[PDB]
Design an enzyme around this catalytic site. Structure first.
Site, PDB file in Angstrom:
ATOM      1  N   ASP A  40       0.856  -1.214   0.000  1.00  0.00           N
ATOM      2  CA  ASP A  40       0.000   0.000   0.000  1.00  0.00           C
ATOM      3  C   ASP A  40       0.884   1.254   0.000  1.00  0.00           C
ATOM      4  OD1 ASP A  40      -2.904   0.876  -0.004  1.00  0.00           O
ATOM      5  OD2 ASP A  40      -2.235   1.879   1.911  1.00  0.00           O
ATOM      6  N   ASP A  66       4.987   3.786  -3.218  1.00  0.00           N
ATOM      7  CA  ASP A  66       4.243   4.729  -4.098  1.00  0.00           C
ATOM      8  C   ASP A  66       4.336   4.211  -5.535  1.00  0.00           C
ATOM      9  OD1 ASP A  66       2.830   7.600  -4.036  1.00  0.00           O
ATOM     10  OD2 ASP A  66       4.044   7.443  -5.861  1.00  0.00           O
ATOM     11  N   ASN A  93      -4.235  -2.961  -8.018  1.00  0.00           N
ATOM     12  CA  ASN A  93      -5.395  -2.098  -7.669  1.00  0.00           C
ATOM     13  C   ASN A  93      -5.074  -0.621  -7.924  1.00  0.00           C
ATOM     14  OD1 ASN A  93      -8.110  -2.958  -6.170  1.00  0.00           O
ATOM     15  ND2 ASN A  93      -6.547  -4.566  -5.950  1.00  0.00           N
ATOM     16  N   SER A 144     -10.382   1.377 -11.658  1.00  0.00           N
ATOM     17  CA  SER A 144     -11.276   2.294 -10.910  1.00  0.00           C
ATOM     18  C   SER A 144     -12.730   1.841 -11.106  1.00  0.00           C
ATOM     19  CB  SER A 144     -11.054   3.711 -11.375  1.00  0.00           C
ATOM     20  OG  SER A 144     -11.241   3.832 -12.781  1.00  0.00           O
ATOM     21  N   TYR A 153     -11.040   9.316 -15.166  1.00  0.00           N
ATOM     22  CA  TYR A 153     -11.081   7.910 -14.652  1.00  0.00           C
ATOM     23  C   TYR A 153     -11.770   6.924 -15.618  1.00  0.00           C
ATOM     24  CZ  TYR A 153      -8.977   8.699 -10.053  1.00  0.00           C
ATOM     25  OH  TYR A 153      -8.145   9.008  -9.022  1.00  0.00           O
ATOM     26  N   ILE A 186     -20.362  -1.404  -5.361  1.00  0.00           N
ATOM     27  CA  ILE A 186     -19.731  -1.990  -4.148  1.00  0.00           C
ATOM     28  C   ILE A 186     -20.117  -1.129  -2.951  1.00  0.00           C
ATOM     29  CG2 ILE A 186     -17.531  -2.577  -3.045  1.00  0.00           C
ATOM     30  CD1 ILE A 186     -18.366  -4.309  -5.554  1.00  0.00           C
ATOM     31  N   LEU A 187     -20.709  -1.766  -1.943  1.00  0.00           N
ATOM     32  CA  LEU A 187     -20.802  -1.183  -0.586  1.00  0.00           C
ATOM     33  C   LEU A 187     -19.385  -1.034  -0.046  1.00  0.00           C
ATOM     34  CD1 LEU A 187     -23.405  -1.815   2.101  1.00  0.00           C
ATOM     35  CD2 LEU A 187     -20.972  -1.768   2.731  1.00  0.00           C
ATOM     36  N   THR A 188     -18.739   0.111  -0.306  1.00  0.00           N
ATOM     37  CA  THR A 188     -17.399   0.503   0.208  1.00  0.00           C
ATOM     38  C   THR A 188     -17.544   1.265   1.533  1.00  0.00           C
ATOM     39  OG1 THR A 188     -15.273   1.376  -0.312  1.00  0.00           O
ATOM     40  CG2 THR A 188     -17.136   2.806  -0.881  1.00  0.00           C
TER      41      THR A 188
END
Lengths: 244, 251, 239, 252
Positions: A40, A66, A93, A144, A153, A186-188
């Site tokens: 990450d 990064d 991702n 995305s 995007y 998506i329920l994010t």
């Protein structure tokens, strides 16, 4: 066929695995028996997902990176081979993404291209030689996540999608599958901090396919596509967005 | 490892006598599904039911021409009577291929009967049956002819492009009934039939633009069908998955 | 200028008694084409002939039910009697938007266009080329029948172009959006209308003139290397 | 006559020195538009400005390196100054081509500086000027590579697929301003460039899968550009017209 959805002996890099969809890819792949580098932008977020994996069984290592620095992407690859010995699986991702006005500063338009296109194309250059050594592997990008205020995007997502289709030619010679997921309704976390009692009941009036899916829904499709069970699936973009 | 199993769930697999639908009827059966095996030929259906019972699953045979609306009503009625419900429908029965522009209109229309009118009617018959048990999943085998362009493909490609698009439309409508609808566009499958045909010189020519450079197995397509019809694709609807190693195989 | 003109060329035009057909008929007459004007209703077809004649002659009427292969065939024989050759074919689907119901969309959008293309290509081959054009239906309410039929017809174009290309015949299609004057009044109301304007970047509905323009472009020597194209005229909308 | 001419309109045309982009400016100027001809070489835009002038049309040279946001801002303001309005933008300049998957990242990023970021910033600049004339049309020249699927094509194809998808995004954002956004994916055009390497035998290789058995002329693209930017396309937005006889033309 159900052991086809296992990854025992396989070694996986996952970018943006600190939170959301990345996170459940990393947990789902580890739990399916793969050694996993959890990467990450955020060191702490990386180590939290690794605690979660390690406390479930499953091998995992944190690496801050990064993805918009090439020096950094190389660090991740060199790290991956250092801790794992080989690379069979790259899951990449982008991060939610979301809306943007036409008059955005160029940097804000360019940023989407780093996340969704460039980083992904370079990490794929970094990992292909490793995969080729080991008689093949699989690369996978999560793009995305409905057409106004979306130039950056939607544009970067369409580039990454036709990049998948073409990469599949270049890398099929090395017996490396290339594919993508377009995640949807998506329920994010965002939408959790923001849902009130009155809407969770209103939504339950609709049928399960008319509501929102979970990040585990993207994670399940990611597993399938990176599994022996999809050994002849390449240049695909699977949209995982329910049915309205 | 349980969201790629179909335990309890009841499947109708059309054209399950040979090649792809046979392999899907077996993979479904062995993943826990109770399986109604439909073919135009009772005799080919029975060989696959026998085989699924030797391997410990539960299948019933049912002869059916998917171009007779009454035979399609009787197929559904049979599924409800031997299984008790329907959860999965695998629409594999189909056909047509290369035809010249000047064919009879009878020959052009057969393509739509086989690939479009049959598919829609069977979906519309099973849908009300799937709502009452809380939803369900419809899968169709489409064709790479739906998204490729070439001479002598008018009837076949257009019929399959309609089918490809019935997937997207039906996914929206049947969303209210909690039903998912998808398709698989298979590459060149090295089936028992083809393995007779295929010389090792034709192999070269077919794979010459196939990046994962081998021919497909029925298992590849049955794996894809298992994923899409399973709880692990509960957020997948209105989608056409192409399994063809990333290319197209000419012949 | 005259690279977008149809002088000396002979157009067959179905669904031409009202709406999008009528405006293509008149545009094409005005562009110099002799026009066979076919509609289901012989009155409607006849008014469009008389209006074209008042404007600058060269039009002929032919009542055709496009869902019956004999009617399709008489219109193709009638069209050769009066015109002598055929250069241009414009199939106009009779579909408004909202099993035997499911099948009608395939007669108008798919089976009419193909069979008309089959009758008219031998004449086009003979005279050394030509051009065929489909207007798909304007086609979420009962449109699963029309959207599937539209998708078929669209890929029919893409494929049928390879077949007819050898014969120097170009094939295209227009997929029109929400378009007024014609009997869309039927169901439009002020609510359903404004719901179309919010998802149309160019804030106005189509006129039949919007299609006829595109139609003239695609059927003129100006588009002489355009084939297998579906052109969406939707003011920026999406399908 | 009426619905397919440009009398009183003001076009900026990028990559306009040769090929497709030269014949777009000539056909546009002939249709009655005022024309700012831009190539990377001022000498190229000038030659073309002379061809236009010698045919009755008002044109002007403004050179531009589309990859620099400052020369982009220089071209924008020159055309405002020269023409007064900007009614039309034809995005045509751009490069890239086949490159191997193991390419330098600098080669990969350049395809995006050429084929996407340029197209978009230049649109960001002319859109407001277009707004206060009551609308305008933007056109981009993309590539069949944006749809086609092959080896050694990652930088070119992806980048062209951004430009092509940009078209339907910009349609939505600029429709409010009454701006139409379209693109054309040209087949193999027998420009002078191509006519100078052509064998009466590679023609054959290219026409192989090509229903209307001939290569294009820059006129075929210019004709198409004129429809899409004329008010006979007043209700065409977010569309890509492919002009290539109904086929793909391959050296493959």
């Amino acid at each position: 066929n159900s052991d086809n959805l296992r990854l025992d002996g396989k070694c996986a890099i996952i970018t943006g695995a600190g939170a959301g969809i990345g996170k459940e890819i990393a947990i789902t792949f580890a739990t399916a028996g793969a050694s996993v580098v959890v990467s990450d932008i955020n060191a702490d977020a990386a180590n939290h997902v690794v605690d979660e994996i390690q406390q479930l069984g499953g091998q995992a290592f944190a690496c801050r990176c990064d993805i918009t620095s090439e020096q950094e992407l190389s660090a991740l690859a060199d790290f991956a081979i250092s801790k794992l010995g080989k690379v069979d699986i790259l899951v990449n991702n982008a991060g939610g993404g979301g809306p943007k006005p036409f008059d955005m500063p160029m940097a804000d338009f360019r940023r989407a291209y780093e996340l969704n296109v460039f980083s992904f194309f370079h990490l794929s250059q970094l990992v292909a030689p490793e995969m080729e050594k080991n008689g093949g592997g699989v690369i996978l990008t999560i793009t995305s996540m409905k057409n106004i205020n979306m130039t950056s995007y939607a544009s970067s997502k369409a580039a990454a999608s036709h990049l998948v289709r073409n990469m599949a030619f270049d890398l099929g010679e090395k017996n490396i599958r290339v594919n993508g997921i377009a995640p949807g309704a998506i329920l994010t976390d965002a939408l959790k901090s923001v849902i009130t009692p009155e809407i969770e009941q209103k939504m339950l009036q609709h049928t399960p396919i008319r509501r929102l899916g979970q990040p585990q829904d993207i994670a399940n499709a990611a597993l399938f596509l990176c599994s022996p069970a999809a050994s002849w699936v390449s240049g695909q973009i699977l949209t995982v967005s329910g049915g309205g």
